[PDB]
Design a protein around this ligand. Structure first.
Ligand SMILES: COc1ccc(NC(=O)N2CCN(C(=O)c3ccco3)CC2)cc1
Length: 119
């Protein structure tokens, strides 16, 4: 029932994501010279280094907020892809499955801790 435990759990999961080869394109911002139409399609850029910095700054209140930003990484890749068969999109999809498999217990434990706190 540790209301703060999500934060280190999210740090460790980001560490796992950074070790995954599938995270390569999503570790830093899209260079808008190699992909100059990017901001015509994507309103809100997001990458894993921005997620990790936000977490480390103390600017997430909850793991739900971190989860929203990580899902934005994936939705941006789906919106920008020219094909459902693209190399970066297909990595986006496997990384998403990995992230959702690992974040489910972090969210569940947080929300249970906050329910216990307010019991
Ligand atoms: C400095 O080194 C960097 C920094 C960032 C990157 N990332 C990068 O260019 N991206 C291309 C667009 N994108 C897609 O989701 C996507 C779907 C289909 C095609 O692209 C996100 C990833 C690469 C090298």
């Amino acid at each position: 029932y540790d209301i703060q435990a999500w934060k280190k759990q999210c740090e460790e999961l980001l560490n796992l994501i950074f070790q995954c080869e599938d995270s390569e394109p999503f570790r830093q911002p899209v260079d808008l010279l190699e992909y100059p139409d990017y901001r015509d399609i994507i309103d809100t850029p997001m990458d894993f280094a921005t997620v990790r910095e936000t977490l480390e700054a103390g600017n997430y209140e909850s793991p739900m907020e971190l989860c929203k930003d990580v899902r934005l990484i994936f939705s941006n890749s789906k919106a920008y892809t020219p094909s459902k068969r693209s190399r970066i999109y297909s990595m986006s999809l496997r990384l998403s499955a990995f992230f959702e498999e690992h974040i489910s217990s972090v969210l569940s434990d947080y929300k249970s801790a906050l329910r216990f706190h307010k019991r």
